[PDB]
Ligand binder design. Structure first.
Ligand SMILES: N=C(N)N1CCC[C@H]1C(=O)N1CCN(C(=O)N2CCC[C@H](C(=O)Nc3ccc(Cl)c(F)c3)C2)CC1
Ligand SMILES: *[C@@H]1O[C@H](CO)[C@@H](O)[C@H](O)[C@H]1NC(C)=O
Ligand SMILES: *[C@@H]1O[C@H](CO)[C@@H](O)[C@H](O)[C@H]1NC(C)=O
Ligand SMILES: *[C@@H]1O[C@H](CO)[C@@H](O)[C@H](O)[C@H]1NC(C)=O
Ligand SMILES: *[C@@H]1O[C@H](CO)[C@@H](O)[C@H](O)[C@H]1NC(C)=O
Ligand SMILES: *[C@@H]1O[C@H](CO)[C@@H](O)[C@H](O)[C@H]1NC(C)=O
Ligand SMILES: *[C@@H]1O[C@H](CO)[C@@H](O)[C@H](O)[C@H]1NC(C)=O
Ligand SMILES: *[C@@H]1O[C@H](CO)[C@@H](O)[C@H](O)[C@H]1NC(C)=O
Ligand SMILES: *[C@@H]1O[C@H](CO)[C@@H](O)[C@H](O)[C@H]1NC(C)=O
Ligand SMILES: *[C@@H]1O[C@H](CO)[C@@H](O)[C@H](O)[C@H]1NC(C)=O
Length: 338
């Protein structure tokens, strides 16, 4: 017997005590070691309601990662609310590691094992766990990186598809590598994507979106304004902030199918995701800066006043990292053992 409840979670990780990498350092002192003997109990004949869009676990992970960045990635200058802090900004070791979220005594985590689960509504195949799986806290916009994959079909996730203001999370079932490099202009970078791989996945995505939108025509367009962090695909590679133009990723025409090369820039002046504010970092480290990531999801925003047209147009979105955490926490919820 249990009931829906919120409580303060703790974290577990395989952090290395000797590592200078900042995620390891934070997990070493803020988490416990991962459960060496994790147990999963299947709940016979249990149906349970989930709502990934109203899930306190997401808020708690958000608070953790903000703390992680605040103790690890300090900018030369932080500009918040009129205040201006000038603190040490050395170059660091940066590579996210999986973090597990675990319940204290008197609580368990319920896990939805329905392979088609979209994040809201009833789940027929429910198990209970002490900890989630290991989630890498990858900060990014537009593209979800290094996550998990949907097990069966591509999944569309949204708090309310009919409401165009609600962010759409696309959960891929086959990852697509994105290989970004600043070769050894020191801020000029690029990302390489297999155009055959990507265009095929994207076609499947549009077909999935057809199913939710009455077989309408699915059109992609570049973001319609905003800050560079959201009009570009933003992410952190080895501590450097990359900003990549994704126009060639979301062009509906696909003489295509070669390597897709996105132009990128490393920016020193950042619009922080942790909260409204601007931060400045030192110029990039020397030599080849490279990151090979898996695209496992897409963040989309649908265009509004098309209620009576023939087209549904989608633009890459992001900005609220809670959606990133939500994309992995969607199948979990905390309950109190009554
Ligand atoms: N957290 C809470 N409680 N919130 C309540 C609703 C909005 C949200 C919120 O209050 N906020 C304020 C701060 N935010 C912001 O100002 N944004 C505008 C500028 C860009 C932002 C970006 O995505 N930055 C970024 C930086 C580096 C990387 Cl690598 C990256 F992938 C992304 C979006 C986040 C949402
Ligand atoms: C339910 O999910 C479990 C994972 O715990 C997996 O073995 C299988 O996909 C499902 N099994 C049943 C009996 O539904
Ligand atoms: C998710 O599944 C539930 C089934 O109960 C349904 O009500 C809802 O419309 C679905 N949402 C999406 C985006 O598929
Ligand atoms: C990328 O995807 C492949 C296959 O989908 C997987 O084996 C590999 O572990 C993934 N890499 C990362 C860093 O997630
Ligand atoms: C991914 O899902 C789509 C349906 O959305 C399906 O057609 C495709 O075969 C799936 N691919 C894999 C590798 O499971
Ligand atoms: C979803 O959004 C539409 C359009 O904004 C609105 O009419 C509808 O009431 C919403 N549905 C729910 C369940 O909130
Ligand atoms: C990534 O791209 C760089 C530069 O083009 C190349 O040297 C490297 O081999 C690529 N890595 C992979 C895994 O494709
Ligand atoms: C690009 O992806 C396709 C489909 O997965 C694959 O067959 C092809 O070998 C890839 N190209 C390269 C150069 O690896
Ligand atoms: C991305 O590239 C396209 C074409 O190269 C360009 O028209 C567009 O302005 C670029 N986007 C941004 C945000 O600079
Ligand atoms: C994704 O994971 C790979 C493998 O650990 C790593 O090399 C890469 O830098 C990661 N990408 C990001 C954006 O953290």
């Amino acid at each position: 017997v249990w009931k829906d409840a919120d409580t303060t979670l703790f974290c577990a990780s395989d952090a290395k005590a000797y590592e200078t990498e900042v995620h390891n350092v934070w997990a070493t002192h803020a988490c416990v070691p991962t459960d060496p003997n994790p147990q999963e109990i299947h709940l016979e004949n249990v149906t349970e309601n989930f709502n990934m869009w109203k899930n306190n676990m997401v808020e708690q992970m958000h608070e953790d990662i903000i703390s992680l960045w605040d103790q690890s990635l300090q900018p030369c200058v932080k500009l918040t609310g009129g205040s201006v802090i000038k603190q040490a900004c050395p170059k660091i070791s940066f590579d996210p590691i999986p973090i597990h979220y675990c319940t204290p005594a008197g609580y368990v985590i319920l896990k939805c094992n329905d392979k088609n689960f979209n994040g809201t509504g009833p789940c027929k195949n429910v198990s209970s766990v002490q900890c989630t799986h290991g989630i890498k806290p990858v900060v990014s916009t537009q593209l979800l990186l290094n996550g998990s994959l949907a097990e069966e079909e591509i999944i569309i996730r949204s708090e309310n598809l009919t409401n165009n203001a609600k962010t759409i999370i696309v959960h891929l079932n086959k990852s697509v590598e994105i290989n970004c490099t600043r070769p050894s202009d020191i801020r000029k970078a690029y990302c390489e994507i297999n155009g055959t791989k990507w265009n095929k996945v994207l076609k499947q995505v549009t077909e999935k979106l057809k199913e939710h939108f009455n077989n309408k025509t699915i059109i992609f367009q570049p973001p319609s304004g905003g800050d560079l962090e959201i009009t570009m695909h933003s992410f952190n590679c080895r501590g450097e902030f990359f900003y990549c133009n994704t126009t060639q990723l979301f062009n509906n025409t696909c003489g295509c199918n070669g390597t897709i090369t996105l132009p990128c820039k490393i920016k020193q002046i950042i619009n922080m995701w942790q909260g409204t504010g601007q931060a400045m970092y030192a110029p990039p480290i020397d030599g080849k800066i490279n990151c090979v990531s898996n695209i496992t999801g897409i963040l989309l925003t649908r265009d509004g006043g098309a209620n009576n047209t023939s087209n549904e147009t989608f633009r890459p979105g992001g900005g609220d990292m809670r959606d990133n955490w939500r994309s992995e926490l969607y199948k979990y919820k905390v309950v109190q053992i009554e």
